[PDB]
Symmetry: D2
Subunit: 196 residues, 4 copies
């Protein structure tokens, strides 16, 4: 059975970038619901699979991809976030990653601008990702609850669903993107970039 | 002149839909979200005028997302304000839609059964989108559209409900089910009847 | 166990639908295309069984496209063969579907008007897909599905027409309008009536 | 507005045999591509009215026709130019020095590139195209669905049409044999000019 992962920090640890109210609702309400609906969908699909019930399996695909994708995405999200005062929020905790970032985009600032443009370009709900595809780095977006497709390894992701910022920033998603860089966990991003 | 759309005034004050929809949501939804759609729509249409005259198909294709999203949201929200009214108004009474409710009961069994089917479609939207009651010929149908897409050609919208998180989050938080439960009290059946007929 | 689907036999010989659909098309469509959908559906379902036992959600999501496409095409083509019959058969006469044709004329005005609306939807499909007459509750509706998608849950298919290019190209080349014109002669209205009822 | 024309082929209809039959080449160019050009012109002329009339619902409804027919006009125009007789020096991979160098740099070799491209081509569900594109300085294999053109930011180097009408008359359901034989008629000279300029 899948479970809601515990946060590595308190609900207010990401302030003033992300409010404590958003963090508590995002984790204890939104993410918690994805886990519940994922387990419910998988149990129903198990019956349809054994019964060779293809129509029911097709009907359950949306629930498994959405809730399974959001559970994957939010689990990554909490781990590539950290308090702004921690050394893990310093990009110097990611020597190899930032080196490849500067090789691909020119500089860290240029990468942040391109990432921000992709994040703000999402129409509706979705996520923005820095992913590793082969040996290079790439900025991709995913719609709704879709996870990153097979072949791209997520380095870090930023949730652009309105529930990720609306209570604090209202419709001003640009301010949310500008301020979220202060709480990006570059230690986790370096760990994912290197892999094993 | 191309790209001369404007933000339409609400048929009511910002607090007229309380307690179903808060004045804070109505003001932000209308004066910020809808206004931004109008602005981005006009700019996109003006750029398209140049690409169309120059027979620039690549530029025309690239501008389609902005026109469908901002033009659709301008269409959808303009319809939205008009199929909403204060809960104490006679237009909020389903008896203001004799022909519509008659077809609703013939199609779903009852108004309550239709409300249950509409609610499941609204709450079933993954991500951002709208839920609609549409007219196709003589029958009625419940459809959903994603993001800012408008209802496709051939189906005539009767009324719509915005399921974007900005439509309820400040008041209802993650409780979108409660938002749908309370929005039935402010549905303008008089407007829905006029569109149906 | 998991993944034990088989290719259903045709209700008629490969040349039984001529001159509407050629014997070469019928044999290739059934023994090659449909057989491939059945095989790839079984393989996808067996691979999913492995991913499910391993609690591998990413692998499960990756397999969804293969299951929907091959499972949908297996459902769609199985329906397709059943709503086709020789033009000289009594099942090919629209009088074999009294209740269906009555609702068709009530919804579109006449059978010819319905054929006009169905043909435009069929010819309007961009790329590969199907056109369907479906039952949604008590009403009738014309819908299209893309690639191998089946009709969504809630709509009951009455009959379908395959608009993939492989369904007509060998006989009609790019003239899909002639393909639609001639396929009405081999529609099995008896099966369509049974599905409607 | 909307005055596009069908481009003439650089060769006779039978010049690509035995890889692509003369019957396919004539139908593909004189029938399929010509219809894309015509329907692109019709959509652009209709859009001029909707644009001047500020008819956003009609403009959104016309987007599919403009992207589909405009994309297919772009795709097929590129297609004819990256095809040439197998006996031509342009069919030899040495005609694209800068291009073929990056191909071996990105995939390892030309054969490795053909294996990856073929899998992408055969993996398309329904109708679509497979492309080798240049993004910045690197190369990538991408696919486009139905009539979509290559996205902005990627420069098409050459494309292979995987619509069933591109091979069905000659290869039937064997799209794998179609991909295997089309490598003999790829015009690397045009692919080099697109890669550089
Ligand atoms: Mn979220
Ligand atoms: Mn809205
Ligand atoms: Mn078929
Ligand atoms: Mn083609």
């Amino acid at each position: 059975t899948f479970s809601l992962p515990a946060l590595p920090y308190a609900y207010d640890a990401l302030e003033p970038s992300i409010s404590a109210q958003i963090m508590e609702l995002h984790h204890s309400k939104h993410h918690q619901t994805y886990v519940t609906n994922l387990n419910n969908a998988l149990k129903t699909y198990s019956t349809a699979l054994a019964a060779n019930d293809v129509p029911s399996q097709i009907a359950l695909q949306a629930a498994i991809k959405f809730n399974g994708g959001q559970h994957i995405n939010h689990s990554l999200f909490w781990e590539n976030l950290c308090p702004a005062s921690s050394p893990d929020a310093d990009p110097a905790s990611a020597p190899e990653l930032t080196a490849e970032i500067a090789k691909t985009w020119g500089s860290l600032d240029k990468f942040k601008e391109a990432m921000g443009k992709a994040l703000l370009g999402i129409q509706g709900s979705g996520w923005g990702w820095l992913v590793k595809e082969g040996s290079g780095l790439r900025i991709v977006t995913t719609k709704d609850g879709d996870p990153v497709v097979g072949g791209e390894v997520p380095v870090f992701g930023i949730d652009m669903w309105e529930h990720a910022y609306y209570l604090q920033y209202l419709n001003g998603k640009a301010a949310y993107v500008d301020n979220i860089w202060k709480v990006i966990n570059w230690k986790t991003a370096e760990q994912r970039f290197k892999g094993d």
